[PDB]
Structure 1
Amino acid sequence: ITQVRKEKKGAGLEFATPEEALAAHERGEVALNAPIKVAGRETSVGRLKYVFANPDEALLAVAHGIVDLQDVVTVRYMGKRLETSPGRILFARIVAEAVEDEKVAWELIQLDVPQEKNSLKDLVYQAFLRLGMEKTARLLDALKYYGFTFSTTSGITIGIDDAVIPEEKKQYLEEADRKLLQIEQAYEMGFLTDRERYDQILQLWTETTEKVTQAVFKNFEENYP
């Protein structure tokens, strides 16, 4: 619920007046969350189109299908005009009600990141320091309840097509097969001892392996986040 959508249809278009942006979105030319610049603002359609007075309004909109929890939007929360998703507002509220202290709760969370293992561990620690173990125990039970609830309906699953083999893999193997031949030649003509040829083949494959790890993850990060 705390990751945000990053979309490509809009692809960094320039607009003068926000209504031009909303119309381009109406025509199906700019994705709701694609980064654009309206009069050099570096904003997106969702932040202009959806402007909620308070968390209750934004979550009511989510309940009615207007926006999803990961859509970036504008919300007014504690006298601030925030550009954030309704899911991050919901997370802030989970902390706030668990610990019954909206001001401290606001100081405690990092609002502009997806919550993961380290940010949640830091939240538990700061809560322990600032609010004591009784309130931290209730925070922990709230995080458990809402994490379990949201993971059920999220759509997380595993099929064989989720282990996405990136294209670069084949190139990095062809490249490798090339350099191997190179090394083989240098051994044929006594330039490399056996130990040196062995060490060089191993270095080649250590580096190729790291390269394909980077390519797997870059493919996920750019195309299947």
Structure 2
Amino acid sequence: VPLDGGRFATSDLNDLYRRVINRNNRLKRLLDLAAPDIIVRNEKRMLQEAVDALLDNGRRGRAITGSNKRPLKSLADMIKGKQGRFRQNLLGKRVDYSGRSVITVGPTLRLHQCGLPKKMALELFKPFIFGKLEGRGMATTIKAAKKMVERELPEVWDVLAEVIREHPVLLNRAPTLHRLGIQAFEPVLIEGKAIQLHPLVCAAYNADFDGDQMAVHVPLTLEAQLEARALMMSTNNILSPANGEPIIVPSQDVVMGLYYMTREAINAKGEGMAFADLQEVDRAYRSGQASLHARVKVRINEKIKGEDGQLTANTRIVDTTVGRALLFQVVPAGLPFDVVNQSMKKKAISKLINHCYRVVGLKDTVIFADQLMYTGFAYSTISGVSIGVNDFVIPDEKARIINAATDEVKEIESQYASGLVTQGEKYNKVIDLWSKANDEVSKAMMANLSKEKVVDREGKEVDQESFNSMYMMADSGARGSAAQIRQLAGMRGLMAKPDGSIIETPITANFREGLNVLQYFISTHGARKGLADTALKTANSGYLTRRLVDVAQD
């Protein structure tokens, strides 16, 4: 193929074929003149090396081309050099009808549908518009229909939405480590330049909103549209393939609004009254005369599905909170009221969806998962939970443990100056003192953070669960665990060195009181070693899943 400026481009495989013909013709000419046997062996040895360099190269021949130093890739070297001794089908293949863009969370979308920009839908469904304009009668030929989609007329958007109504498109992230990485969704024409994704489905993709890109795919054959709706739909893969736990679980933002809704309080506004049904609880709450969580008593008409094909009706007068009665409206008529009487934590709600899908079905579970997310985001905005400097309650007895441990370590150093204790004994007798002192700090913090509430109701003093913003984001399991709260309230502990040994000097200060200069340099050892193993974890785990699928492929 020529290039710019009249310069050609010859492949290296053609050079090997031309070298053989230059020597094969000389063999026929030399053998037609009664040449001596000494000169015939010189030509036959050159023909052997020419054919040897044509099949493979780099082993013993290593032919060097002109104006360069790299060896020429032969035919057998082309198969080895094809994506590293692999085939073109087993490697990455460029496909059509695709596109990548930045993802964006959308709380106004259903579980089976997603978002799609208007400019992307015109390029992906381009062959589908030409078929609809000719069948309708607006476009006569296919050439006139091309100028209608590029002119952005007012009649091309009405015909475009006709093929987007029922057309499951595929979505996938860059790293695919499980089957839930490729799910089919129903695209909805939205305005913008981003893919509007569902908040609940983000747990399966394991992707956060920080600049991630997800590619799209449009199936053309109707045979592929049926197997993408019945198998690849987001409503079908509601259970993880690993275990029986569902993969569509309310995330940290949804579980925060549901935990505050189902809570117990000692004294509240509107406590002690009764209601006729669930319709009276919603009216009394939105009127501003009843609190969100108050000890009341209501009578509900619950239905139990213990008998197959029969739905009995029973009336029970239970005494629960105000918010717990509002959450039962979302729960269908196949589950009792005891499943919503708890605090509705993260692990306590993952077993409710697994139980709802097992005793009701799939059609009523997808609608229940969407209404649970709608009532989780609406009640999370009403309660303006915020983290501040007063939420990090530092225990007043924390300074007593540090000052006591500072006097015990000085006694060990005063003994080591004489020599009655060896170096190996004093090292283990001081590294366990700080480990034992870390438990007393965490025990004194959890006892103060949980009881950080003082209320009164016709009495002097009454204790209950604390309503702190930090405790709600840790007990509910939304984000973080109990091991991360110890770094903010209490001391961090003994930051071990990446060499294999633990550093004796601990970090007494926390994140609120501020770290020192030498105390912050020690924290850079464990933080830099954690990032070095994270980038290497994608190569070792990716290599483990690459050998198991090759033996378990048949």
* Superposed pair shares fold, TM > 0.5: yes
Tell me the residue number matched to 2:325. Answer: 89
Q: Does the 8 Å CA contact 2:300/2:317 hold for their aligned counterparts?
A: yes
What is residue 428 of structure 2 aligned with on the other side? 199
- Structure-to-structure mapping, 1:163-182, within 5 angstroms: 163-182=392-411
Tell me the secondary structure at the aligned position of residue 285 of structure 2: helix
What's the RMSD between the two structures over aligned residues? Answer: 2.3
2:291 is aligned with 1:68 = yes
* Matched position secondary structure for 1:95: coil
SS for the counterpart of 2:401 is: helix
Q: Which has the larger radius of gyration?
A: 2
Q: State the SS of the aligned residue for 2:341.
A: coil
Deviation for aligned residue 1:120: 0.8
**Superimposed CA distance per residue, residues 172-200 of structure 1 (whole angstroms, 9 cap, x where no aligned partner):** 21222232234334434545322322222
Partner Cα distance (2:321, 2:399) in 1: 38
Matches within 5 A, 1:16-165: 31-32=267-268, 46=271, 49-78=272-301, 79-96=315-332, 102=333, 104-106=334-336, 110-165=339-394
| CA deviations over 1:91-116 (Å, ceiling 9, x no partner) | 111112xxxxx2x2226x52331101
SS at match of 1:110: helix
Deviation per residue, 1:115-162 (Å, 9 max, x gap): 011111001101121122222222111111111111112111111222
8 Å Cα contact 2:268-2:293 kept in structure 1: no
Say which of 260, 263, 266 aligns to 1:3.
263
SS in 2 for 1:125: helix
Partner Cα separation in structure 2 for residue 73 and residue 190 of structure 1: 71
Q: Quick check: which one's strand share is greater?
A: 2
The equivalent residue for 1:216 is: 445
- Output the CA distance in 2 between the equivalents of 1:182 and 1:110: 56
Q: Shift of residue 88 of structure 1?
A: 0.7
Structure 1 residue 85: deviation in Å?
A: 0.5
Distance 2:319 2:412 in 1: 55
Instruction: Tell me, in whole angstroms, the C-alpha distance in 2 between the residues paired with 1:202 and 1:128.
Output: 51
Secondary structure of the equivalent of 1:160? coil
Letter in 1 for 2:394: I
Q: Distance in 2 between matches of 1:191 and 1:89?
A: 70
- Equivalent residues of 2:281, 2:322 under 8 A apart: yes
Q: How far did 1:89 drift?
A: 1.0
Structure 2 residue matching 1:192: 3-state secondary structure: coil
Amino acid at match of 2:328: A
Is the 1:50–1:74 contact (alpha carbons within 8 Å) kept by the matching residues of 2? yes
Gaps of 5+ in 2: 1-260, 302-314, 453-465, 468-554
Instruction: Pick closer, same or farther for the CA change 1:195–1:67 going to 2, 3 Å.
Output: farther
In structure 1, C-alpha distance between the alignment counterparts of 2:323 and 2:295, rounded to whole Å: 9
Distance in 2 between the 1:94 and 1:141 partners? 10
Q: Secondary structure at the match of 2:340?
A: coil
How many equivalent pairs are there? 181
Q: What's 1:39 paired with? A: none
**CA distance in 1: counterparts of 2:369 and 2:284, whole angstroms:** 28
Segments of structure 1 that go 5 or more residues without pairing to the other structure are: 7-30, 34-44, 97-101
Q: Which protein has greater RCO, CA pairs closer than 8 Å, 6+ apart?
A: 1
